[PDB]
Design an enzyme around this catalytic site. Structure first.
Site, PDB file in Angstrom:
ATOM      1  CE  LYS A 100       9.554   3.518  -5.263  1.00  0.00           C
ATOM      2  NZ  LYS A 100      10.755   3.626  -4.662  1.00  0.00           N
ATOM      3  CE1 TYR A 142     -20.931  -2.173  10.798  1.00  0.00           C
ATOM      4  CE2 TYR A 142     -19.337  -1.136   9.364  1.00  0.00           C
ATOM      5  CZ  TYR A 142     -20.372  -2.211   9.579  1.00  0.00           C
ATOM      6  OH  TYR A 142     -20.776  -3.042   8.576  1.00  0.00           O
TER       7      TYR A 142
HETATM    8  C1  LIG Z   1      15.857   3.420  -5.299  1.00  0.00           C
HETATM    9  C2  LIG Z   1      14.860   4.799  -5.713  1.00  0.00           C
HETATM   10  N1  LIG Z   1      15.289   5.734  -6.285  1.00  0.00           N
HETATM   11  C3  LIG Z   1      14.431   6.538  -6.297  1.00  0.00           C
HETATM   12  C4  LIG Z   1      13.525   6.776  -5.916  1.00  0.00           C
HETATM   13  C5  LIG Z   1      12.497   7.964  -6.015  1.00  0.00           C
HETATM   14  O1  LIG Z   1      12.729   8.845  -4.948  1.00  0.00           O
HETATM   15  P1  LIG Z   1      11.812  10.075  -4.409  1.00  0.00           P
HETATM   16  O2  LIG Z   1      10.399   9.983  -4.681  1.00  0.00           O
HETATM   17  O3  LIG Z   1      12.163  10.603  -2.902  1.00  0.00           O
HETATM   18  O4  LIG Z   1      11.895  10.955  -5.264  1.00  0.00           O
HETATM   19  C6  LIG Z   1      12.828   5.588  -4.997  1.00  0.00           C
HETATM   20  C7  LIG Z   1      13.579   4.652  -5.168  1.00  0.00           C
HETATM   21  O5  LIG Z   1      13.293   3.679  -4.321  1.00  0.00           O
HETATM   22  C1  LIG Z   2     -24.847  -3.642   4.505  1.00  0.00           C
HETATM   23  C2  LIG Z   2     -23.599  -4.726   5.006  1.00  0.00           C
HETATM   24  N1  LIG Z   2     -23.926  -6.003   5.287  1.00  0.00           N
HETATM   25  C3  LIG Z   2     -22.997  -7.042   5.626  1.00  0.00           C
HETATM   26  C4  LIG Z   2     -21.608  -6.739   5.496  1.00  0.00           C
HETATM   27  C5  LIG Z   2     -20.607  -7.765   5.918  1.00  0.00           C
HETATM   28  O1  LIG Z   2     -20.443  -7.666   7.357  1.00  0.00           O
HETATM   29  P1  LIG Z   2     -19.425  -8.698   8.234  1.00  0.00           P
HETATM   30  O2  LIG Z   2     -18.106  -8.834   7.765  1.00  0.00           O
HETATM   31  O3  LIG Z   2     -18.915  -7.879   9.673  1.00  0.00           O
HETATM   32  O4  LIG Z   2     -19.758  -9.804   8.052  1.00  0.00           O
HETATM   33  C6  LIG Z   2     -21.122  -5.406   5.190  1.00  0.00           C
HETATM   34  C7  LIG Z   2     -22.235  -4.507   4.721  1.00  0.00           C
HETATM   35  O5  LIG Z   2     -22.121  -3.441   4.396  1.00  0.00           O
HETATM   36 CL   LIG Z   3     -15.722  -0.425  13.352  1.00  0.00          CL
END
Ligand SMILES: Cc1ncc(COP(=O)(O)O)cc1O
Ligand SMILES: Cc1ncc(COP(=O)(O)O)cc1O
Ligand SMILES: [Cl-]
Ligand SMILES: [Cl-]
Ligand SMILES: [Cl-]
Ligand SMILES: [Cl-]
Ligand SMILES: [Cl-]
Ligand SMILES: [Cl-]
Ligand SMILES: [Cl-]
Ligand SMILES: [Mg+2]
Ligand SMILES: [Mg+2]
Ligand SMILES: [Mg+2]
Ligand SMILES: [Mg+2]
Ligand SMILES: [Mg+2]
Ligand SMILES: [Mg+2]
Ligand SMILES: [Mg+2]
Ligand SMILES: [Mg+2]
Ligand SMILES: [Mg+2]
Ligand SMILES: [Mg+2]
Ligand SMILES: [Mg+2]
Ligand SMILES: [Mg+2]
Ligand SMILES: [Mg+2]
Ligand SMILES: [Mg+2]
Ligand SMILES: [Mg+2]
Ligand SMILES: [Mg+2]
Ligand SMILES: [Mg+2]
Ligand SMILES: [Mg+2]
Ligand SMILES: [Mg+2]
Ligand SMILES: [Mg+2]
Lengths: 386, 386
Positions: A39, A272
């Site tokens: 899953k 940032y």
């Molecule tokens: C119902 C269910 N059954 C089994 C698993 C697998 O568990 P693990 O990753 O701890 O092995 C997940 C689950 O949601």
């Molecule tokens: C170079 C660059 N420029 C602009 C953005 C967008 O910024 P905001 O979400 O704060 O508007 C991201 C970015 O990596």
């Molecule tokens: Cl930040």
């Protein structure tokens, strides 16, 4: 060598997956089958190639979280049984039957209504069903032996349904105090004995997750559900420290340095918030991974990556697509150098378990939140594909 | 009504996105263009449908994190300019030219080798390039006047490359102390004036993110980069509390109740670790979302969802695909009831901002980590579609 525009990728080692399946198979009773739990995109490893490999090397069946996840596997050419572990709406009963996907259910009305849907549709296929018995997880499942008997009866009277399994889930099988796990096991067995006393023949009985498979292999019954262990990761430190089964982590997360600079001119603020100020001769390398890849923003000024076999620290805040790390004063590094974000490099290792401890979570969450925009490559018999 | 096998979904309101674009357009100078930032799958909203709507209602270019993110948009039929904001390896120069993707660069060697690749291909189009000037973010970009000039001369001498923009990024424009932002602006202007004093005509100049567009609209130059604000979210509480631009959140995250039960019988343990014990008349509702969807495991025993206009608490641990919430003693609820995980319901609201504060992170991370296995539905002119 790998050719990417944005140079971040995952390597899934299928040789380790095979070794992990072998170690669980060698530990649990010979008669017990293995259901590989793939899953959530194979816990972020890629459901298709992990499922294909597991079925080649020991597993008999698969488990997924939804019909949609099971259909992805059928479309990959997989013919093995596929169980949906969660709740499936009656809107998808027709589709699930047509794709030969096995659904979990635990209520009389759902059984009767699903049957009627398939009846009205003149369904060519019968729908396979596992019954979930809730013995203490409190999530899904029938909780009393009286109601369980009514659910079984409704399922059996439904000619368009096919009973192929019955299961329960342990909620604390990975903990030192085994009291609750033994109570759940005792309750599950009592419910199953109640059915047999009514003359009911039981289908495939499964109850163990990875934790109970390692700590209580005698509960393996007809089949276990191998999840976290398939990926080479233990369900808890306690289970790992039992030292009963040797698992090999399958997933590594890598990138190549996008740019290297010495912070010679001012300002020497990094990322940032300007939360990090570099020295005039300090070398800063920029890496194409960020929190939208699943590399947690809480690793800001805290995480480490491996470069040339050494841990180098994250400098400043993680950004959405990029991080910066410090190579130190006059540190050696070049654009293109390979960096290991989760995994091993030369002597060193930054395990997913260590990242999870730093973030106060569990390895399950670290791997299963790796974004699908990171490409996955697979190693089998020592060489890469896909 | 929506028909899903696993009943968790996102709704992205494009009417809100339109209003957000208008609010920013109405605030910045009339001549300034808007580049809509749709990296990281549109900050988790879906890059394609947000980009499409934005280019229709005020935006004229797009920004992404990678060539691969730009190719997704081109395949959906988007022909507007697309700028890659991070580093692009030279192995993707030819492909970016074929797909008409604009790349950022800032190094003489990169310009020369990229031009050499295209020269050997006799490419029928110049590759568009923006130069990144690092004025204090310390991530990517050239950091001195004299190296900027060398980079510009190499780009202009590269006949197969085309200079179409120059930019910098502010690192603290969402903060109350504006000192560093004013220093960054002063330095960027100083570098650009040094280029003009060499006789160089500048292409499109851009420097504002959402924060600076709101707090310093006078910095908007030829174009701004509208990211977080496009989705109706503020870059910081300080910027929001300036009350200068009204934004409306575009994203809601919803599910339907998979199962409702009264914890009549023992044990009344809920979820992994049995960290929650229910009362005998307490009602537990199970919901098909978990940490592999991006719903942080750190919300175990802490988060809230909205049901019938009321906040109800997460009970026990978040699991990979499911959570359980308490509807209280004798609580009323039915399988199939709609629950709001992020967003509004009746008079109640659980904003992405409130989730981010609980988790000591920022709204950017909460939305951009929403898994692609959650289907996204879009509302336009008050009605839903694909
Ligand atoms: C119902 C269910 N059954 C089994 C698993 C697998 O568990 P693990 O990753 O701890 O092995 C997940 C689950 O949601
Ligand atoms: C170079 C660059 N420029 C602009 C953005 C967008 O910024 P905001 O979400 O704060 O508007 C991201 C970015 O990596
Ligand atoms: Cl930040
Ligand atoms: Cl049901
Ligand atoms: Cl369960
Ligand atoms: Cl994803
Ligand atoms: Cl470079
Ligand atoms: Cl930058
Ligand atoms: Cl847990
Ligand atoms: Mg390699
Ligand atoms: Mg042994
Ligand atoms: Mg079938
Ligand atoms: Mg009932
Ligand atoms: Mg039957
Ligand atoms: Mg038998
Ligand atoms: Mg011991
Ligand atoms: Mg190991
Ligand atoms: Mg501060
Ligand atoms: Mg230092
Ligand atoms: Mg996370
Ligand atoms: Mg609706
Ligand atoms: Mg240099
Ligand atoms: Mg040129
Ligand atoms: Mg001009
Ligand atoms: Mg004020
Ligand atoms: Mg609001
Ligand atoms: Mg405990
Ligand atoms: Mg209680
Ligand atoms: Mg609480």
């Amino acid at each position: 060598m790998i050719k990417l525009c944005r140079e971040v990728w995952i390597e899934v080692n299928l040789d380790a997956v095979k070794k992990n399946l072998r170690a669980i198979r060698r530990h649990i009773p010979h008669k017990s089958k293995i259901m590989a739990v793939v899953k959530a995109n194979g816990y972020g490893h890629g459901s298709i190639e992990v499922a294909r490999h597991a079925l080649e090397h020991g597993a008999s069946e698969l488990a997924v979280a939804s019909v949609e996840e099971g259909i992805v596997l059928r479309k990959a050419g997989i013919t093995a049984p596929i169980l949906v572990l969660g709740f499936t709406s009656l809107s998808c009963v027709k589709k699930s039957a047509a794709w030969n996907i096995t659904l979990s259910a635990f209520q009389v009305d759902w059984m009767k209504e699903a049957n009627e849907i398939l009846e009205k549709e003149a369904s060519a296929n019968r729908l396979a069903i596992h019954i979930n018995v809730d013995t203490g997880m409190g999530r899904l499942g029938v909780r009393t032996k009286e109601e369980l008997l009514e659910v079984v009866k409704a399922l059996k009277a439904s000619k368009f349904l096919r009973w192929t399994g019955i299961f329960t889930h342990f909620s604390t099988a990975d903990e030192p105090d085994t009291t609750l796990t033994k109570l759940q096991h005792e309750k599950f067995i009592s419910f199953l004995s109640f059915l047999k006393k009514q003359g009911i023949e039981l289908p495939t009985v499964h109850m163990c997750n990875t934790a109970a498979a390692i700590a209580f292999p005698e509960f393996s019954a007809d089949m276990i559900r191998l999840g976290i262990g398939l990926y080479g990761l233990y369900p808890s430190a306690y289970i790992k420290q039992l030292n009963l089964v040797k698992l090999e982590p399958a997933l590594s997360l890598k990138a190549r340095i996008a740019y290297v600079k010495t912070m010679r001119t001012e300002p020497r603020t990094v990322s940032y918030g300007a939360t990090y100020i570099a020295e005039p001769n300090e070398v800063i390398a920029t890496l194409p991974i960020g929190y939208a890849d699943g590399y947690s923003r809480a690793l800001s000024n805290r995480g480490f990556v491996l470069h040339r076999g050494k841990r180098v620290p994250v400098a400043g805040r993680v950004t959405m697509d990029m991080i910066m790390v410090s190579l130190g004063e006059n540190g050696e590094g070049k654009q293109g150098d390979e960096v290991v974000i989760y995994g091993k490099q030369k002597g060193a290792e930054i395990s997913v378990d260590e990242v999870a401890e730093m973030l106060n979570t569990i390895n399950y969450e670290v791997v299963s939140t790796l974004s699908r925009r990171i490409p996955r490559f697979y190693i089998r018999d020592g060489e890469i594909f896909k």
